[PDB]
Amino acid sequence: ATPRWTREHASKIERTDETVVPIIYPPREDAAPEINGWDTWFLRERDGSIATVGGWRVIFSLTAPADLLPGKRHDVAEIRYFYSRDGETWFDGGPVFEGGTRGSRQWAGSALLDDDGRLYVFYTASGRAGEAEITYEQRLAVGSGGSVVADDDGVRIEGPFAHGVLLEPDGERYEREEQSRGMIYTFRDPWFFEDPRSGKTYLLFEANTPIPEGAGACGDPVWEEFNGSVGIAHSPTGDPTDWELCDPLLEGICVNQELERPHVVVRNGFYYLFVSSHDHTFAPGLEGPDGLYGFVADSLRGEYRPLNGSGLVLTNPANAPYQAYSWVAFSHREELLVSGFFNYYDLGGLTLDDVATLSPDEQRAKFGGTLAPTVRVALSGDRTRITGTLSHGRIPLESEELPDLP
Ligand SMILES: OC[C@H]1O[C@@](CO)(OC[C@@]2(O[C@H]3O[C@H](CO)[C@@H](O)[C@H](O)[C@H]3O)O[C@H](CO)[C@@H](O)[C@@H]2O)[C@@H](O)[C@@H]1O
């Protein structure tokens, strides 16, 4: 009996002063002017803390050339890494992988620097390598056996990498491309997670739960097409490359198709599950914004209930509604910090579909492709509140003091 994000929940979704981030203004100069970057994740230790190699943090982004049309970046996404000594001033480390990477292009995942010093970069293999025309087949892959070397000058990630597919949908608990009714199926965004209570090793991902035709599982057959779910796999050995599929943590059946970049933050006794979702991926009769949605339980595989009653944790203002996306939450002392990327801004009133109308120059003019100002939020049980922001893409360590709040 999988925990459900229900239509009764989504009906309550509504922008409030506690969930709306300030307006994002473009940062004064870019770390890589030639490159657009989105969907970023942190190099973490096994426990989940941000990894530090000779005083450097490492982060990973999906990247495309800046001269490319924003709407098309997803077809040629390549994983680059960046490194920083403070958490503000990031240096471009270049592409992480030299070749032998799975899929026509790579989508978001996670990064593990294991106790043994071995590097695992989990990613989504979209399509198949050297395919004729672009396909939308997603499988959870890993580039294993990496090395992270750090001097006083910077960080280089050195090869060779052993690329292999880890998981594909079973067709019973997790929908395959064949079973996809309505929009394209999801099976992506593999996020590594060691449960600090059990010690057991898991891998979360975004999937869909298959719904048979005429299942009656919803109060209207078209609602059944919106079958988004947060899937999880287990490693009995704790080997980061050996996984068995488990039952999904949470489903948004009749509510939403895309429960994107799922991840868990554990805070005192409690498991907060966070997913980023779109306005256009909501089932008909429901109205929610592009935002970070969140749920809480007393255990990793517990009865998740939505934060703030509706599930909406954080969103953009009505007058800049696509300015950020692909938020990733992480603990810092008594605060929760949330890092998205700077998405589409200065649309005036145009919808995202309408941005494909405009001249190439006018399209690139309305896309950030940098890290958003990281949001500071305060959790209090099943309730959240925005407390303020930091500099663009500040990822601080727990050993660092943050500025005071108003
Ligand atoms: O797709 C690769 C990579 O991007 C992710 C998260 O950004 O999906 C993004 C997605 O939406 C993009 O395009 C929409 C407009 O349709 C825009 O509103 C949004 O800001 C963009 O991120 O792009 C694909 C399109 O098929 C969808 O999967 C998703 O809605 C993520 O899934 C992945 O790591």
Side-chain angles (χ1 to χ4, degrees), residues 16-76:
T16 56
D17 294 19
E18 293 83 20
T19 59
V20 172
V21 300
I23 289 162
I24 303 165
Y25 293 107
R28 287 293 182 273
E29 293 199 15
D30 194 1
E34 63 185 15
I35 291 303
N36 277 335
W38 65 108
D39 277 41
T40 75
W41 65 90
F42 320 142
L43 181 63
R44 299 173 183 255
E45 287 180 24
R46 212 164 218 280
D47 58 43
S49 57
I50 289 86
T52 173
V53 182
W56 304 94
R57 321 145 168 71
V58 177
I59 65 181
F60 300 85
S61 299
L62 298 188
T63 71
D67 64 348
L68 191 60
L69 281 82
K72 290 304 156 214
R73 71 189 186 280
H74 312 286
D75 294 331
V76 300

Side-chain angles (χ1 to χ4, degrees), residues 39 62 73-74 107-108 188-189 258 260 278 280 343 352:
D39 277 41
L62 298 188
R73 71 189 186 280
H74 312 286
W107 290 356
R188 55 158 177 272
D189 300 340
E258 285 182 347
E260 295 210 32
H278 294 104
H280 66 77
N343 192 29
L352 281 177

Side-chain angles (χ1 to χ4, degrees), residues 243-308:
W243 304 96
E244 299 165 12
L245 290 180
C246 301
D247 290 13
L249 291 179
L250 175 75
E251 289 162 352
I253 292 177
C254 322
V255 172
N256 203 287
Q257 168 83 14
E258 285 182 347
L259 298 193
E260 295 210 32
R261 277 172 66 55
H263 58 288
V264 177
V265 174
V266 192
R267 284 194 71 82
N268 300 149
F270 296 132
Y271 294 73
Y272 291 80
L273 175 60
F274 290 111
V275 292
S276 314
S277 188
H278 294 104
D279 50 8
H280 66 77
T281 58
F282 273 104
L286 299 176
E287 292 184 8
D290 268 38
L292 178 70
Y293 297 82
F295 311 79
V296 66
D298 68 15
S299 66
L300 169 60
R301 295 168 57 71
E303 289 291 336
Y304 283 107
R305 303 159 195 286
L307 297 176
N308 301 309

